Amino acid sequence: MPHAFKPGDLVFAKMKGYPHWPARIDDIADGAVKPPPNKYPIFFFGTHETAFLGPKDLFPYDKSKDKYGKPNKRKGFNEGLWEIQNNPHASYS
Ligand SMILES: CC1(C)CCCN1CCN
């Protein structure tokens, strides 16, 4: 059975006005700004943006990839698909 989300988990994350986007639950670096209560730091592959989301917008990658893991015209999306499949735990600093 599922656990809670933890850093390193791979997801498609949903933001208003955007397709479900390949992303990961990030760690918070020492000294870094912490998310709000009940939110996780989401790192979006491809665009390398960060946003803070709750579980309602987080779809586990393995379950969801057949639905959401297809090319998109949006900027950074296909680069994002490559990263989540090929090196999802790399430094993209
Ligand atoms: C990838 C994502 C949907 C995350 C938040 C902003 N961004 C789109 C705008 N560049």
Swiss-Prot record:
Subcellular location: Nucleus; Cytoplasm
Signal sequence region: none
Residue ranges of domain PWWP in the record: 7-64
Tissue specificity: Widely expressed. High expression is found in heart, skeletal muscle, ovary and testis. Overexpression is frequently observed in hepatocellular carcinoma samples.
Record function comment: Acts as an epigenetic regulator of myogenesis in cooperation with DPF3a (isoform 2 of DPF3/BAF45C). Associates with the BAF complex via its interaction with DPF3a and HDGFL2-DPF3a activate myogenic genes by increasing chromatin accessibility through recruitment of SMARCA4/BRG1/BAF190A (ATPase subunit of the BAF complex) to myogenic gene promoters. Promotes the repair of DNA double-strand breaks (DSBs) through the homologous recombination pathway by facilitating the recruitment of the DNA endonuclease RBBP8 to the DSBs.
Subunit field text: Interacts with HDGF. Interacts with trimethylated 'Lys-36' of histone H3 (H3K36me3). Interacts with trimethylated 'Lys-79' of histone H3 (H3K79me3), but has higher affinity for H3K36me3. Interacts with IWS1. Interacts with H2AX, POGZ, RBBP8 and CBX1. Interacts with histones H3K9me3, H3K27me3 and H3K36me2. Interacts with DPF3a (isoform 2 of DPF3/BAF45C). Interacts with SMARCA4/BRG1/BAF190A, SMARCC1/BAF155 and SMARCD1/BAF60A in a DPF3a-dependent manner.
Family: Belongs to the HDGF family.
Annotated protein name in UniProt: Hepatoma-derived growth factor-related protein 2
Biological source species: Homo sapiens
